[PDB]
Amino acid sequence: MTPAFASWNEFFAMGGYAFFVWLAVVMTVIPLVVLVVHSVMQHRAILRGVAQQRA
Amino acid sequence: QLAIPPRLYQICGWFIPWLAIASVVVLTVGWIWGFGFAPADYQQGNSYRIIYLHVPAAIWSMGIYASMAVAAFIGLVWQMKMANLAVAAMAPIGAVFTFIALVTGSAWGKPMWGTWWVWDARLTSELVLLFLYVGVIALWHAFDDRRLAGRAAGILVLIGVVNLPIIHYSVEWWNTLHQGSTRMQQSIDPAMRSPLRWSIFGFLLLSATLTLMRMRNLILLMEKRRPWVSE
Amino acid sequence: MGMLEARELLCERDERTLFSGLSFTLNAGEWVQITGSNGAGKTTLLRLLTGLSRPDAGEVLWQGQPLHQVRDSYHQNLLWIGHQPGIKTRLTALENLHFYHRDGDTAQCLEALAQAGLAGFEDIPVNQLSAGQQRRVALARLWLTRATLWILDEPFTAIDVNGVDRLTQRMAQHTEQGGIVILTTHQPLNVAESKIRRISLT
Amino acid sequence: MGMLEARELLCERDERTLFSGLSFTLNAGEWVQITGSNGAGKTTLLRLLTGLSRPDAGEVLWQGQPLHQVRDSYHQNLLWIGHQPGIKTRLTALENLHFYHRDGDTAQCLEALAQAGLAGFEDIPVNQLSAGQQRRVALARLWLTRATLWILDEPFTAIDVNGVDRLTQRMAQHTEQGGIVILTTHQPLNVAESKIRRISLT
Amino acid sequence: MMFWRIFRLELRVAFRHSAEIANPLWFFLIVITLFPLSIGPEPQLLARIAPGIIWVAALLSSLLALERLFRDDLQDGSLEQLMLLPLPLPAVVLAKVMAHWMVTGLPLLILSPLVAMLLGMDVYGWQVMALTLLLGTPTLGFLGAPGVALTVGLKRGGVLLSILVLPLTIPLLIFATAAMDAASMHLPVDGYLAILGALLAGTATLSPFATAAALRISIQ
Amino acid sequence: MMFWRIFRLELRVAFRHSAEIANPLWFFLIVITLFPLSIGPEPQLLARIAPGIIWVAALLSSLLALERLFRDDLQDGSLEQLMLLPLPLPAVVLAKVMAHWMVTGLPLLILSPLVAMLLGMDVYGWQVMALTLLLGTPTLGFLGAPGVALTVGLKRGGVLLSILVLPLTIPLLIFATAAMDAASMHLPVDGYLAILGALLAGTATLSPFATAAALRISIQ
């Protein structure tokens, strides 16, 4: 109902240290996405390798 | 009660959806009831917010590694091959958490330090923890024959848990020897701790999701020559 | 009540099942050869039997106890000679056998080395000798030890015909008295087959 | 006039003269085997004719010219397989074949390897494969290459009888088109001795 | 034929299958952090010693990879790469040593921004640092390749103490380690860098023939 | 089959393995002679930098020496201790590593007066690095024993061993460098030695069991 900020990206995403906070959040979100995508793609690749082994 | 067959893949398959669908609903509260609802401090302005992206990446930085000893203790004295693979399962998760913690520390240092890197105990400890993590990763991805890489990783992580408190406790004293003071005081603000608790529980819930999902992968990588995988 | 047995031993190399549920009991004075057709090296079973390697399934029982409970008196009653000679190839032949000899040294080692056929090759570094004579140094340990349970892995590797009869005349007394000898060879035994118990990898 | 004409070859490895004055010429459609014992200059002779090493005296004269002089069109029409397979231990057979294949066809290698015998092993790493299959893959470059000079150093190392038969029958069609082949093996060849030349290592 | 496919061969040996190239990287990070712990977090002192440590670590990793250049190949594949491949033997060597840099130089250039901030050098101390570890690392491989030949017969260590390759590397090190002094005191390297490219030009055209002669005599 | 028999045999075979047992000493010498020219000759600067560089050199020398602890006997003589020699395997590890310190730590200790005279440290400085090397190098051996016991199984590497051992030796480096830094202004140093002795006892109390277990891992 009420935020700690005041307005849109002119008030949000710019608090005087915006670059550091946004660099931190992006460099945290990227490794998690990399981990999950690597794990799921490896999961699919193991079944692919099992299927191709069936020959 | 504990007669684990190669059913874990079927066992931790009913857990992944419910443990991950809830892994975002609690994290979307620890990051939105923060980052826009939590008032900031006075000395750092609107920069006292990286806590949620740094402290949970630091508490579970060692919280995973402390769980490694249990995963290796059961896998050595009781000689359980499956649980030993757990040590090889969540290691990348811990390494990523440590790297995230280091990056967030470097980013948080800039407003006050003026430079990217200064050797601090609360940060060099995470650096050396990353170093033990990458050592474990290199050890496991070295043996061509399985059922041995896990056991070597278990003994190595046991040695690491033995030597970790000594290393850390030498680190804060080495920091005091040269610099001689503390940077930030242990003050968390009463109306700033509940968002931190929510973020801690969210990161814990996501780490469990990653470790179970990787456990599903590791079982197949070592049990790929049996009729069980006929499905 | 007898000595070393087997309890549903099973090992896997992750591609083939070498053996499933192996179980055999050995009492005193029995001559054994591992005769199971090579899927892999028979050395794996022998190592599991000696206790260096932990069985994938089952356990090996010595004198009524497993090999991880009693691990001091069992190694006194043990002698393992594999493909690898197990001798430091920088010292002389006399020095290597001296280490494995408990007492009364320098008065029985050289005689054993001489009867082994390396007479005149005592005070000479091992590395300077032939591979057919290097294995002779390892095989010369047979006449000095007092171990009761011999485990020989491919004993007739590079030994000449003149020594094979002496070997299968000293073990011909060891197994008669109290010995437990386990060979694994592709060449056959000139000794009569009616006495040896052949067991196959099943 | 005429292919490799190594004249008065001489070698003095260690303290023994392996061979002296080996001045033998090779004509077209010539299939020959080197007769010797285990310890003679069997490997040195092949490495000296291939130009990898240089003889103590004499020289090897290809097509009437020294090997080391032209050294450009002799590499493209020569196939030398030594005791070692020559294959990287971590790569699988198929990409090694594309490398060694001079067109990078990715298809002809399939039937070439299938005729070798490893049908269904086109993607398993050679280290994960068996030992004899490694030499089989190494020697599999006989249905792809069109080089009219084959130097076969112990081809029949640990391959089965059927593999020996298929390789020997494949060897037969080479001798008449343009093929000139030299072997160094301890296994007597099953084909008739009438088409075999034999060189004694004197 | 097609030195490109040979180059792809060493890349697939290293990159695709044997994910080992990360190992010397983490070791070089070990070395990078090992010194500040022994000396202290005291910043400006680390701003001067840094080139020496980074270059000794780089040469250590390079000499470690020199063993994998040849000795892992000698037992099984070293004559077929010479017997076959009708293109000149020097050109065969280039690709292999061109993999060496791809194993030892490229990771260092990629991680250089990370190291230049751990020790505490300014940006200008990195722009000049980028164009000395890329202009100097390949050259080290070029002049270290010829002496390998058969210097170590079967043993891993032994004559790698100094033998012959290392004494010729020192006159390279006297340049780079003295170039960054100009970076420490903030003047352009200029001439001290202009000769480094000449060193590359003098080792990318004659060293290959030295390697060819050395291996040809060794196999003889 | 005796403890002292094991030690005597290991010493006797150690001497015949020459041309590589002095290689760590030569590496120590070359790095300690390279560093003064790596950074340049300045009295105060060399005095400040010496305590760290001599210990990183000792660490590298021990790392190089540790590769031959269990590598040589792997294919021939790493066996005959587990199946025989009824003495517990931890005792075997203790014998082997203490003999390794005899052949490696002691020669590192014996040239310390030469190193002190070369780098200018006083008699008090000679005493301080002599004592810290006496109590330090055995800890290096005990800490590297599990690492080598693990890495002999791979039998193709060496940088593995480095990553396994080096991060485990950080507190030793910290305390030793702190002790030497306390010796520059000649303030009394006895407290830093007590902690070094405590960690020596700790690593001599638990590492042999861990190394025995690691050998049991590698053999299978």
UniProtKB/Swiss-Prot annotation, chain A:
Keywords: Cell inner membrane, Cell membrane, Cytochrome c-type biogenesis, Membrane, Transmembrane, Transmembrane helix, Transport. It comes from the Bacteria. It is found in: Cell inner membrane. GO terms for biological process: cytochrome c biosynthetic process; cytochrome complex assembly; heme import across plasma membrane. It is a single-pass membrane protein. GO terms for cellular component: ATP-binding cassette (ABC) transporter complex; plasma membrane. The chain crosses the membrane at residues 18-37. Required for the export of heme to the periplasm for the biogenesis of c-type cytochromes. Belongs to the CcmD/CycX/HelD family. This is Heme exporter protein D. It comes from Escherichia coli (strain K12). The lineage of its organism: Bacteria, Pseudomonadati, Pseudomonadota, Gammaproteobacteria, Enterobacterales. The chain holds residues 1 to 55 of 69 of the full protein.
Swiss-Prot record, chain B:
Keywords: Cell inner membrane, Cell membrane, Cytochrome c-type biogenesis, Membrane, Transmembrane, Transmembrane helix, Transport. Residues 36-57, 106-122, 175-199 are periplasmic. It holds the Pfam family Cytochrom_C_asm. The keyword Transcription regulation does not apply. The keyword Membrane applies. One of its GO terms (biological process) is heme import across plasma membrane. It is a multi-pass membrane protein. One of its GO terms (molecular function) is heme binding. The chain crosses the membrane at residues 15-35, 58-78, 85-105, 123-143, 154-174, 200-220. Belongs to the CcmC/CycZ/HelC family. PANTHER family: CYTOCHROME B_B6 PROTEIN-RELATED (PTHR30071:SF1), HEME EXPORTER PROTEIN C (PTHR30071). Required for the export of heme to the periplasm for the biogenesis of c-type cytochromes. NCBIfam families: ccmC. This is Heme exporter protein C.
Curated annotation (Swiss-Prot), chains C, D:
Its EC number is 7.6.2.5. Residues 4-202 form the ABC transporter domain. Keywords: ATP-binding, Cell inner membrane, Cell membrane, Cytochrome c-type biogenesis, Membrane, Nucleotide-binding, Translocase, Transport. ATP binds at G36, S37, N38, G39, A40, G41, K42, T43. It is a peripheral membrane protein. It catalyses: heme b(in) + ATP + H2O = heme b(out) + ADP + phosphate + H(+). The keyword Nucleotide-binding applies. One of its GO terms (biological process) is heme import across plasma membrane. One of its GO terms (cellular component) is ATP-binding cassette (ABC) transporter complex. Pfam families: ABC_tran. Its main location: membrane. It is found in: Cell inner membrane. It is an enzyme of class 7 (translocase). One of its GO terms (molecular function) is ATP binding. The keyword Phosphoprotein does not apply. The complex is composed of two ATP-binding proteins (CcmA) and two transmembrane proteins (CcmB). Belongs to the ABC transporter superfamily. CcmA exporter (TC 3.A.1.107) family. Part of the ABC transporter complex CcmAB involved in the biogenesis of c-type cytochromes; once thought to export heme, this seems not to be the case, but its exact role is uncertain. Responsible for energy coupling to the transport system. This is Cytochrome c biogenesis ATP-binding export protein CcmA. The gene is ccmA.
UniProtKB/Swiss-Prot annotation, chains E, F:
GO terms for cellular component: ATP-binding cassette (ABC) transporter complex; plasma membrane. The chain crosses the membrane at residues 21-41, 45-65, 101-121, 128-148, 159-179, 193-213. It is found in: Cell inner membrane. InterPro entries: Cyt_c_biogenesis_CcmB (IPR003544), Cyt_c_CcmB_bac (IPR026031). Residues 1-20, 66-100, 149-158, 214-220 are cytoplasmic. It comes from the Bacteria. Keywords: Cell inner membrane, Cell membrane, Cytochrome c-type biogenesis, Membrane, Transmembrane, Transmembrane helix, Transport. Residues 42-44, 122-127, 180-192 are periplasmic. One of its GO terms (biological process) is cytochrome complex assembly. It is a multi-pass membrane protein. Coiled coil: none annotated. GO terms for molecular function: heme transmembrane transporter activity. NCBIfam families: ccmB. Required for the export of heme to the periplasm for the biogenesis of c-type cytochromes. Belongs to the CcmB/CycW/HelB family. This is Heme exporter protein B. It comes from Escherichia coli (strain K12). The gene is ccmB.
